[PDB]
Each structure stands twice: as C-alpha cells, then as structure tokens.
Amino acid sequence: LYQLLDGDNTQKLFRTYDGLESVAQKLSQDIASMRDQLEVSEQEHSLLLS
Amino acid sequence: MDEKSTKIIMWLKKMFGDKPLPPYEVNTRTMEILYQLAEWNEARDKDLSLVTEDLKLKSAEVKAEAKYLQDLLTEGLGPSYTNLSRMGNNYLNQIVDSCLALELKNSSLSSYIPA
Amino acid sequence: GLQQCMLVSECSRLLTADSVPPSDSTSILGLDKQDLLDLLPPNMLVLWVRD
Amino acid sequence: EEEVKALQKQKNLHIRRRNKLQMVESGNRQMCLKSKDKEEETGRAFQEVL
Amino acid sequence: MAQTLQYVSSRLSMLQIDEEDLERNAQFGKVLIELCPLLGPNGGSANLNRE
Amino acid sequence: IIQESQRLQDSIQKEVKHFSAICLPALLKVSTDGFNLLPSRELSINRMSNTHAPYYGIFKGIYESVRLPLYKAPESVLSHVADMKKQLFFLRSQLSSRSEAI
Amino acid sequence: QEQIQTAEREIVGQDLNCERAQDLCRRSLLLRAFNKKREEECEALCQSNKK
C-alpha cells in the first residue's frame, strides 16, 4: 500500500503507519486540488467564451 | 530527446516482444504521445502488479479463515449445520450473494445498510 | 447448551494451535483438548441442542 | 413530471429507510445496554472462578 | 481515419489525439491500433490485466 | 522435599497471574502457506474485523483518508487506491488539454 | 440523506462487539478446566501425605 501511494522506490529504511496515513491523505488532496484547478480552468474558459 | 527516444524504443520492444517494430513517422509530436503513453503504461503496470500480488495473499488468508470457521462450526454445532433444508440453503445463498454483490466486509446489518 | 458447546469449541481451538504434533508442546495452563470436552453438557443434551 | 414523480418516490423511499434505520438504531442501542449488563454478569462469574 | 481515432480514443482515453495527428502521420496511426490490444482499457498491459 | 515443595508454593496463583495477562486471540494461529502459523488477528483481512483489533484505529484512519467506505471488504483497499491514481492521471491529462486549448 | 448518513454512523459505532464478555467467558471456562486439573493434582498429593 505504501509502495502504491509513494511511487518512489525510495527505499525508505523505516516505514510507519503514521507515514502511510499521511501519504494516503496527500493522494486525496492531490485529486481534490486537481479537480479545483480544472474547475478554475473551466471558469476561465467560460469567461473567455462570454 | 535522445533519452525519451531510447525509453520509447525500449518500451515498444517490450510491448511488441519478438515482432519487428512497425515503421512509424518519428516527429516531435508522435514521440511526445508515445512517451506519455509509455509513462502511463509503466506506472499502471506497476500498480496492477502490486494489486495482483496482494489479491493472491488475500485469497490465501481468506481460505485459511474459511477453514478455521468451518472447523469451529463443525466442532461446536456438529455436521448438521451443513444439512439445511432446500429453502434454508436458498436463503443462505441469497444473503451470501447479496453481500458479494455489494463487496461487504461481513454479513452484518451495519455493513449492508450503508452499502 | 448452545453457548457452552460454542465456548468449548472456541477454547479447544485456542489450545490446538493446529501446530504439528510436536509430542513436546506445552499447552496453556497444561490443558489438553480432552480436559475441555469434559466440560460439555451431557451427550443427550448436546444432540438435542444440535437438532 | 416524471422526474418530480421519480424524486417523490425517492423521497418516500429515503423516509422509509430513515425510519427503519431509526428502529434498528433504537433496537441496537437497547441491545448494547443489555450487553453491558452481560459483561458485568460474566465479570462476576469470572471473579467466582478466581 | 475518423474510425481509427474513435477506436484509439475509446481504448486510450488518456491520449489527446487529434485527427491532424493521424492525417500527417498514417504509419503512426497503425502503430497505435496495434498497441490498443496490447494495452488494456485502463492503460495497463493486456497480460497483466488478464492475470 | 523442602526445596521442591517451595517451588510449587503458590503455583496456581502464579500461573493464573500469567494467564490473566495473555491475549487469547493471539493464540488463534492459522497457516496460510501450510508452514507459517500466524495469529489470526495479524492477518491483513482482520485489521477491520473488530473495533478492538490492535490496528483498527490506524486503518480506520487510512479508509477515511482514501474515502473508502468502512463496510467494504479489506481486499478492496489496494484496488481502490490504484483507481484513484488512475483518476489523478486522467485529471492531469484533462487539465493539460484544456490549458492548451485555452 | 444527511440524516441517513448520521444514523448510519451511529449504527456502525454501535456495532456491539461483545468481545470483552466473550473473552471473559473463554477465560472462565479455561480456568474452570484448569481448576479441575489442579484438584486432581491436590488429590494425588493428599494420597502421598497419607502414606
């Protein structure tokens, strides 16, 4: 699960459960942030069209 | 451009195996598209491998637990718990099939209702 | 009767770490499966409960 | 109109399901209180064995 | 050509491919069609998806 | 005799004290590969089975972070996270396409 | 839907796992079985003292 979330084979010598929850929160935040950017971009596009 | 090109050629060789790489128009755009595709495929292949290995592990663990519960019930309730009436078996199968359809953790109402 | 049958079964299993007979493995509290089976209700009551 | 009918049906459904849930919740709450009493009884039986 | 695009876009939903790309690059389009079966609907390798 | 009798002095109490400290479920060992007996509580499928399981609080937190419902089977967590990553890639591609179009 | 979700969170929170009561029952049974074995051992020492 940690490998799936961090992508980076950075052989972190010590994986913690708290670290796992943090990386999971980051993915959710990244998706939310990307959706917000897309929404902004959609507004920008709509303004240009208007 | 020379590094991306190498990655694409290696990736295409991997995908087409023993089949000669088909000739295609090598321009800046075709290379970018192929490069995005190669990056995407590589990232997904990695994810799918990890999921596949985990499912194998989970299949083993579920099997072990199934055996445990079966043994527990046989020893506690006797072999007679498996000799349910036709309707009883139908009811059991429907609960089981409903739970599988909703991908539930267990057959409790606390899981079924929210699902 | 049913509660007792389930409990005995659960506890029997706690004892029987399906492990490999090691002829030498120290049971918890020195109890064997047979020590628990003795705490089952009478065989007539067990059959009645299962039916 | 069909949508209004469909949404009304859905509303009725959600109301029925909410009611059922409230029943299940009340029933479970009662069961949880009684289970605490069992824990206390079994706790006494355990002290007798000790 | 429009059919090839639709096919590639449906299977490779991530690829932003325009009709101009396939018109200027006919042999490239053939490569993409050949890659589509090798790549599952989700961008993963067909073998790994089967597994 | 005095020496051996002293060894057995309060023997019942000593054993009961050690027993009271043990976790019973830790005794339930299951073999997944036929060779290695692991406690059933340590199995990945049971991390969410009971509110009293040692790792329940941690995984509850992980489920909520990835927006996976608690009623879902534990075997679904990796597949779900993989899909989320897939979605992230798709959203990035859409943003890039839209930014180019603008 | 907000009301249903609140009620759902409550049911999930009430998931009565009587694991503590069950643990006590298991322990009680095991200790009863242990007591019986220790009574047999006491009877054996009593016989030795008579001799």
Curated annotation (Swiss-Prot), chain A:
Subcellular location per UniProt equals:
Cytoplasm, Cytoskeleton, Microtubule organizing center, Centrosome; Cytoplasm, Cytoskeleton, Spindle
Q: Which residues form a coiled coil?
A: 15-46
Explain the purpose of this protein. Answer: Contributes to mitotic spindle assembly, maintenance of centrosome integrity and completion of cytokinesis as part of the HAUS augmin-like complex.
Q: How does it assemble?
A: Component of the HAUS augmin-like complex. The complex interacts with the gamma-tubulin ring complex and this interaction is required for spindle assembly.
Family label: Belongs to the HAUS3 family.
Name this protein carries in UniProt: HAUS augmin-like complex subunit 3
Per the UniProt record, the source organism is Xenopus laevis
Identify the gene encoding this protein: haus3
